[PDB]
Design a binder for this molecule. Structure first.
Ligand SMILES: [Zn+2]
Ligand SMILES: [Zn+2]
Ligand SMILES: [Zn+2]
Lengths: 155, 155, 155
């Protein structure tokens, strides 16, 4: 069994909605990024790559490479997962923590769990996503961006 | 074995002391929250709920529900744990990281470990709590609030 | 199997280079600290101590103790590891996440993995280090300091 950890942040910018955990969540502003800026999945991705000792998403899919511009993060999640399984690993379970003052993630978590579980080909019970606020404190507290953390256990 | 991760932040406000890890720590200002605002235990709670795939504390005990106003977080910790065990899980071990510029957590960690170990009905050796500063950097660095992180492994 | 988590931050100050993961990385400014201020290794250290239920680096090697002034963090990593093994633990694997806007950590990760793997006496495949930016957001985003997170699994 191997443990992995990921972390990611993206600044707000442009018009909404945002894409978090694969779900299109309506919001005033959107998120600035080379890909779709899905903070939730980038963190999950790194956590998986991390546990598999495959590095990180920024080594696998560079900002530099314009092929990744506008990239659907689920697409990136599946590839990393493809490569992870190839190295011989299987999913133990994953946990994700979105840190944002707004929008409300809560109602969207189930659909997120559906997308992720599909993408990893695991049962939803092996996928958990949760959310928290920094109580107005911080760049997140000030609504300047959204951060996310994730842990994974591969077998 | 399942892995979980939690994270929480609370802003300073009012008069002290604060309650971190169940311990009443003397401080100038206190912590703003719907419950007792015990950052340490909320993070631990989510980490456990997370590993058990039971969501998060904000789904289990809403800000909205006035029954939780002033709630003793150990009380919330025990319930989540009750439900977690009901799902068939047992404690592997937990690790908590308090991130605060002040007050000094260090002297209080043992008592915190005593409360948590009791609450989870595990041996203290399965419970670890530590502390760190952001070296004046950040909302925590500026003494605007206290954040905490936690990881848990259920069996 | 036990899980551990660590976290650390250090402010920029003085002239560079910085020392992250044991590697001397060239940078304009350096990092302020009592030891060499190697954020990466302090976080890794706490993660290991954490999983072993041995507390944290600030309890083991105090700021107060002037013997630790200028301390090479690898030296601290090895001791904590010494004590950790003495308690009967062996390395499962570790994952580290450096959070910095600059300098570029990426090219240095391999050497970091070499130092850490040596220090823990494990194969490099059991050691993973990755890096991320807060996209200009935060004290890290503003280039005020560098933070790092880490998870470890002991057996
Ligand atoms: Zn990202
Ligand atoms: Zn809280
Ligand atoms: Zn440090």
């Amino acid at each position: 069994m191997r443990i992995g950890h990921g972390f990611d942040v993206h600044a707000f910018g442009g018009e909404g909605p945002i894409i978090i955990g694969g779900v299109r969540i309506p919001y005033e502003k959107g998120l600035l990024a080379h890909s779709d800026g899905d903070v939730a999945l980038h963190a999950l991705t790194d956590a998986l790559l991390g546990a598999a000792a495959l590095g990180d998403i920024g080594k696998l899919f560079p900002d530099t490479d314009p092929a990744f511009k506008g990239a659907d993060s689920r697409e990136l999640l599946r590839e990393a997962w493809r490569r992870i399984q190839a190295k011989g690993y299987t999913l133990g379970n994953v946990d994700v923590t979105i840190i944002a003052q707004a929008p409300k993630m809560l109602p969207h978590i189930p659909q997120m769990r559906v997308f992720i579980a599909e993408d990893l080909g695991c049962h939803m019970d092996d996928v958990n996503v949760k959310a928290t606020t920094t109580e107005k404190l911080g760049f997140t507290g000030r609504g300047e961006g959204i951060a996310c953390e994730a842990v994974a256990l591969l077998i």
